Amino acid sequence: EVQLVETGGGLVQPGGSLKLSCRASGYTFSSFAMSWVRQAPGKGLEWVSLINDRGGLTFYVDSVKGRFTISRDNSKNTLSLQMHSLRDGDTAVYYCATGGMSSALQSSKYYFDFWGQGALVTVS
Amino acid sequence: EVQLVETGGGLVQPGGSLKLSCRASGYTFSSFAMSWVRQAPGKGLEWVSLINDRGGLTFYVDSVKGRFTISRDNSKNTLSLQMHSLRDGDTAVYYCATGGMSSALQSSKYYFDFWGQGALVTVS
Amino acid sequence: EVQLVETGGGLVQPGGSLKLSCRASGYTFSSFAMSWVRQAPGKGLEWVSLINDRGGLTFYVDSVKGRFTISRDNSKNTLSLQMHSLRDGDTAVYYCATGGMSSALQSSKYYFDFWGQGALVTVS
Amino acid sequence: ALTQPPSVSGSPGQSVTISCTGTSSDIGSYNYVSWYQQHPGKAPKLMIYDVTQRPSGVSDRFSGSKSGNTASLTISGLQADDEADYYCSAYAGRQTFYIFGGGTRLTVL
Amino acid sequence: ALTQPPSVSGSPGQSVTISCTGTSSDIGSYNYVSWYQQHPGKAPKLMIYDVTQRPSGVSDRFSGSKSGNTASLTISGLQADDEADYYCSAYAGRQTFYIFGGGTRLTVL
Amino acid sequence: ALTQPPSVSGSPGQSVTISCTGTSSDIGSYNYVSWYQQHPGKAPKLMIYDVTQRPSGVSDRFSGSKSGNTASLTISGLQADDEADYYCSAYAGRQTFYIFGGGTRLTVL
Amino acid sequence: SLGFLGAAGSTMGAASMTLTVQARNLLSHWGIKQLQARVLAVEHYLRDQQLLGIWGCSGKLICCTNVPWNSSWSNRNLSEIWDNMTWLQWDKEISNYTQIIYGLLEESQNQQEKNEQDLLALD
Amino acid sequence: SLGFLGAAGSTMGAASMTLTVQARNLLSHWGIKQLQARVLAVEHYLRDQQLLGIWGCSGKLICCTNVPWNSSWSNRNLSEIWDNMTWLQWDKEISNYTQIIYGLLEESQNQQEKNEQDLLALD
């Protein structure tokens, strides 16, 4: 069994910031890439960010590239996302997911293997 | 006398694929860069693609960059262009020409000196 | 006291060219980066070009990348700007300024330390 | 950036095809299209990866394919528990990592 | 391409603030924001550099700060010699070296 | 991206000119402008290359020049058979290799 | 942190992170025996560095190339090669093909340098 | 221009422009003494070139790295170091931290090289 549980916050006013934190268990955290994917309440899924297994490399969608920071702590087995300058268009459920990248010596993925419960982030 | 003969296809349906060949004689084939230039029935000349003398480097116009492949086989003196996903905007006479680049140790060209007769490619 | 004196001309016809130059004293010329900044008669300041202290590296605002050349003579103390294909939109006072860049082994600047009084360039 | 129909339906026990149409820079060039099943109120589950390969834990009723720039998922043997929103995830290179455009509501009659 | 208000004013001895707002790629990225004072008919003079620093040769009245994407210049008590057009200049990376705002006509009542 | 006159004309024995205008990134910066003569119903052949040079096999009636961003082909001693659509080909750089203009119809009176 | 050859019994993946640990240990009448041993150490080092130069891998420890794996040299997947095998076992497994691989690497660089030269010849 | 060590007494910002002058002079029974002297010169040269390779600085005389400068190693400002100090004084001042710096440089390249591999492994 693999679990990903988001412990992030809720409502923040426009222009503020919110940090999300995903607790991962049931697998070796340092062996997988991690990402954040969001779904607006009435829309489909949207990929937001991707971080490598070691944490050295991060990738973002252009719409958040200068606003969101993705980081990992492989000693605590946690994934964090710090979202700055939140906009009304960022209201969505944010899902923590395992997969999306392989560190060169692993077989290819380019898909997401595990999804978390999902935190609901809203902007006034 | 240098001759280029575009022994390629003709009519294709929208969304289909068509390959063009160009046979050449009268000069050392593996010594000139080659390119394809197209002319819509009522328009002027448009450059489509360029390949080096050795065939390792290819260049395309953005409008065909993800659809056309230019290749050479220097043992048969044959140039070819494989066109995928042809659209109505691609209807044109396609001319084979012996130039547009030189491999650093040769004098500069950028001439398109010898031209063939041209294959007529149409899209229904 | 640092003195920067522009000796460039002030009237050119559209499509022509005009060379401006700036003489400087009071500081070691070869120790500072220099730039040209322009101000339209009714507008604020606009950065036009930047040259490092050695003279090998030049940077331009996108609107002039294909038209202006910035160079400097570190034997004698002269900063020159050769402007080709001037347009009516380029009418402005062009100020000679010292600063804007430090050569890796110097403290950071990214600001302008000294200003000349500026040459007024009218197109048409 | 992918085009996917908003909904499909079919008779229970029969096969339904859900498809996504992309471009040469995403579905065409890369064979990394995956399909997800998202039940309302739940996080998406991975159903198909690498276009045709299903993960362990998913039954043999879900199988995909691709041709040209169009990818599809065929769901045979439709069950009452298969009502979910289905999505594609295409890999579009290092500049545009994933495209999740879509969302097909599958109704089992 | 920075936005700052026009016509900031106040009486002699009163404090005023002149500020400019940029974006996340310039003022909010690099802490290299300078301010210039341009009297009509004169070339701009440097007043503030590196957001909070000032060159030797000017008074302690002129100072500044940065928060978020907004830079702010404070002049302390106004004097008649402060009636000039003030401009922001922010570093904006390697592709766009400097971005300037419009001028603020400071009126001393 | 080059502009050419739709047509030019002149009587036999007269000189005519055809001009092409580009931008600083193509005709201006690169001295690689070539001219082609396309008879109706025939493939074009090279007439002028490297702005001023001509290939072996053609007469010296055809010559070229460049000034600023304008390229020009002069045809002196116009013959009855010099009726053709003329084109420029400019080298634009590494991102864009060649730019052709519209054809100029040369009619001999 | 395991020292020179400390990763020899570890998997290929884990061992790939200790290349610098041992790379530093390749350089550092009775006078002739010691002097010849020092010269041989230099000759072996330089032959390996020259070979990396020929392949376009000069100055790097993990050098990626343009030569595809043909699945006949070894048909093991990456999971088995990197997580369930040591470098000694791998070296034995493909010993008979190393001269083939090296030859292809040389040819690949020869084509790449010409391509770079041709790209650099465009204005 | 100034000579083999002509810039030795000049400030760091001046002596840094003569790096090729010093670099070109590092390579060039009694036979045993002469051979030991030549082999030792070669060994020292190779130790320095290998060390530069480990840091990702092979083939460069001025190599910029991603290791931040620690204010505990030297608290002088950049202008004071490059305009008012020679390389001999700096070498003495930073001697006790040289091996620390070297270790960090190695670690930096090890992370960077793996990161480059992962960037290259994206399709």
Add this chain to the structure above:
Amino acid sequence: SLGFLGAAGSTMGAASMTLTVQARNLLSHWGIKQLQARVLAVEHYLRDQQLLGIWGCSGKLICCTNVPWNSSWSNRNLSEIWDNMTWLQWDKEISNYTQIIYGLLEESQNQQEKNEQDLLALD
């Protein structure tokens, strides 16, 4: 393909495809004579590699610089140098000018390194 010096009589263009063939054969009292032969071969190799490094050409067999060709060194066009001519004839012609070219290559790389350092120092 043609052997160690098989291209020696071929034209300069044709011989440019065999650079690895010659490059890979440069490294490979009786003891003193053998050691002097090995040390001398090593020193020649290292001096040439150092010189390439100074020019910014480390790790390459074909390297393009920013030094323009001066017609006073040779005014022959490309069709007279890369064809209809061998490398031996070229070396005979480019003899009196070799040190001038090497000096220019060193100065050009020094400027290239300073310019790269300044560009990389921009935030």
